[PDB]
Amino acid sequence: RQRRPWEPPLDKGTVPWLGHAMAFRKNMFEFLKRMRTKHGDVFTVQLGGQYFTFVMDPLSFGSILKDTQRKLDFGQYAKKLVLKVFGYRSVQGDHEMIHSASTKHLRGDGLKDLNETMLDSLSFVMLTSKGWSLDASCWHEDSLFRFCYYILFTAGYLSLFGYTKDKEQDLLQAGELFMEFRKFDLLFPRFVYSLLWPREWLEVGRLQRLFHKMLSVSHEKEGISNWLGNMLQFLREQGVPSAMQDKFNFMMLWASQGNTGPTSFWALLYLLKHPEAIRAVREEATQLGALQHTPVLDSVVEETLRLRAAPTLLRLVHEDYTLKMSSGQEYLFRHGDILALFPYLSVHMDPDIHPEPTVFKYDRFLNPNGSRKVDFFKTGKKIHHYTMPWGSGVSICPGRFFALSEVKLFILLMVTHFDLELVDPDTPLPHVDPQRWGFGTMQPSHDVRFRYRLH
């Protein structure tokens, strides 16, 4: 590839025939930081087979996301990724099925019917696996990350993929599945990057075949979410075999449980590390369908996602795309190239939009009167895209409302019915594990111990 004057700069790396794959996969966040300062806001690099063009100017996010014409497509790239990782082969129309099923059953009425079960399942799991002793004041030490993740995963799994007659048995396997899910989740970025030791490729194979069987469409379950059954109806109706339906189910299990848990971890952890904040939500909590009446919690969860939701927004260009920068410069993107945004660096951590951006400020999105603050600026200019945990366009997360009910209910239940303390409130928060930069909600570099007991 030879660059044309009208294209953005093309950086081939100091050592050519190697590129930036090594520095990119190691710490994507730091790699893009260096590139922004070196080439400015728009630059192109080769990763894997593809050529990627990054746009770091938040002001230009406007036209790109409102793809007025038909030029950018998220699904053409995503289907390649899920094929490698889950072996699911996209069929004509499944992209629209998912969104229809989601708008219909993960929003409005579908969502409240579902939220009622999620609450039921989250209460049952907390109580049953709580841990007990003959002494009623006994503290119980656990690991906060594994704790939150196991809770959201079990309740999420049972609310979506169905429960059975024996509700204790459900929990037991749900926990057994969790352990194996966590093993798959941990290898996932390196799987996407093919940076696995030969033994690890086998583990990913075993985990695949394992979930395929547990979630198999032949396997007695009652009351599965309308979201899932609606989607399998489409698949069976288009002649999708059952084996491929099993691969579909595993992909949706990972999609629906992959971030909700880790996001709960950071929120509760930020709340424990800021007495100011945990009291505001506890008090809001004390005083059914009240999830829409928690402005304080709402802002605690936006701020958490601002600090720990670091996805990449990828679009394949299938017709030559022309981007005009606020500056006054035009840039041409070739069809076949991957358009990429990293709103974490461009938006979340921009000090002009969010002063002291690396600081958890539970009230960051609250107006002095407690109303919702939706007015943010970069040097006088209004930024409609001030937080971007879900993305935008026709590919914005169709489960973001469920995820939010999921996380909000967990927090409320925890801060209400439990005494919480960090084993070591003096040590610094774990930093993001850099190997997952760009894949959704970040995960801690190391777990933190915490103790809990009832009131």
Ligand X SMILES: Clc1ccc([C@@H](Cn2ccnc2)OCc2ccsc2Cl)c(Cl)c1
Judged by CB, which is closer to ligand X: 251, or 415?
Answer: 251
Judged by CB, which is closer to ligand HEM: 265, or 452?
Answer: 265
Among positions 8, 58, 311, 444, the unique one binding ligand X when judged by CB under 6 A: 311
Judged by CB, which is closer to ligand X: 126, or 396?
Answer: 396
User: For residues 45 and 395, what is the distance between their CA atoms, to the nearest angstrom?
Assistant: 24
With CB under 6 A as the contact rule, which of the stretches 78-86, 140-148, 193-201, 349-357 interacts with ligand X?
Answer: 78-86
Judged by CB, which is closer to ligand X: 98, or 122?
Answer: 98
The residue type found at 335 is H
Residue nearest to ligand X (CB): 255
Shortest distance in whole angstroms from residue 97 CB to ligand HEM: 10
Among positions 438, 443, 444, 452, the unique one binding ligand X when judged by CB under 6 A: 438
The yes or no reply on residue 32 touching ligand X (CB under 6 A) is no
82 binds, among ligand HEM, ligand X, none (CB under 5 to 8 A by kind): ligand X
The yes or no reply on residue 413 touching ligand X (CB under 6 A) is no
With CB under 6 A as the contact rule, which of the stretches 32-40, 62-70, 146-154, 307-315 interacts with ligand X?
Answer: 307-315
DSSP string, 10-77: B---SSTTTTTHHHHHH-HHHHHHHHHHHH-SEEEEEETTEEEEEE--GGGHHHHHS--SS-EESHHH
Shortest distance in whole angstroms from residue 79 CB to ligand X: 9
Shortest distance in whole angstroms from residue 120 CB to ligand HEM: 18
441 binds, among ligand X, ligand HEM, none (CB under 5 to 8 A by kind): ligand HEM
Pairing of strands 42-47, 50-55: antiparallel
The answer to whether 360 and 367 have CB atoms below 8 angstroms apart is no
Judged by CB, which is closer to ligand HEM: 391, or 430?
Answer: 391
Residue nearest to ligand HEM (CB): 391
User: For residues 67 and 339, what is the distance between their CA atoms, to the nearest angstrom?
Assistant: 12
User: For residues 340 and 343, what is the distance between their CA atoms, to the nearest angstrom?
Assistant: 10
Catalog residues that contact ligand HEM under the rule CB under 6 A.
74-75, 95, 98-99, 255-256, 259-260, 263, 309, 311, 313, 389-393, 395-400, 402-403, 440-441
The answer to whether 260 and 181 have CB atoms below 8 angstroms apart is no
- Report 324-343 residues binding ligand X (CB under 6 A): none
Judged by CB, which is closer to ligand X: 187, or 255?
Answer: 255
Closest to 347 in 3D by CA, of 57, 15, 90, 35: 57
Pairing of strands 338-341, 50-55: parallel
Among positions 10, 47, 59, 78, the unique one binding ligand X when judged by CB under 6 A: 78
Shortest distance in whole angstroms from residue 306 CB to ligand HEM: 11
274 binds, among ligand HEM, ligand X, none (CB under 5 to 8 A by kind): none
47 binds, among ligand X, ligand HEM, none (CB under 5 to 8 A by kind): none
Output the furthest CA–CA distance in the chain (Å, rounded): 76
User: For residues 243 and 124, what is the distance between their CA atoms, to the nearest angstrom?
Assistant: 32
Token pair belonging to 304: 């958490």
Judged by CB, which is closer to ligand HEM: 95, or 361?
Answer: 95
Token pair belonging to 242: 């059952």
Among positions 1, 3, 63, 81, the unique one binding ligand X when judged by CB under 6 A: 81
81 binds, among ligand HEM, ligand X, none (CB under 5 to 8 A by kind): ligand X
The answer to whether 125 and 264 have CB atoms below 8 angstroms apart is no
Three-state SS for 283? helix
Could you give the count of Cα atoms lying within 13 Å of 310 in the half-sphere of its Cβ? 21
The answer to whether 151 and 126 have CB atoms below 8 angstroms apart is yes
User: For residues 341 and 52, what is the distance between their CA atoms, to the nearest angstrom?
Assistant: 10
- Report 385-404 residues binding ligand X (CB under 6 A): 397
126 binds, among ligand HEM, ligand X, none (CB under 5 to 8 A by kind): none
**Helix H or strand E encompassing 400:** helix 400-417
The yes or no reply on residue 24 touching ligand X (CB under 6 A) is no
> Measured between alpha carbons, how far is residue 449 from residues 257, 417, 439 in Å?
23, 19, 25
**Helix H or strand E encompassing 330:** strand 330-333
The yes or no reply on residue 316 touching ligand X (CB under 6 A) is no
User: For residues 203 and 208, what is the distance between their CA atoms, to the nearest angstrom?
Assistant: 8
Among positions 8, 58, 162, 440, the unique one binding ligand X when judged by CB under 6 A: 440
The CA radius of gyration of the chain, in Å to the nearest whole number, is 22
Judged by CB, which is closer to ligand X: 81, or 359?
Answer: 81
Token pair belonging to 233: 């109806």
Judged by CB, which is closer to ligand X: 162, or 438?
Answer: 438
Is residue 397 annotated as involved in ligand binding? Answer: yes
Contact residues toward ligand X (CB under 6 A) are 78, 81-82, 251, 255, 258-259, 311-312, 314, 397, 438-440
Report the binding-site residues for heme.
Answer: 397
Report the binding-site residues.
Answer: 397
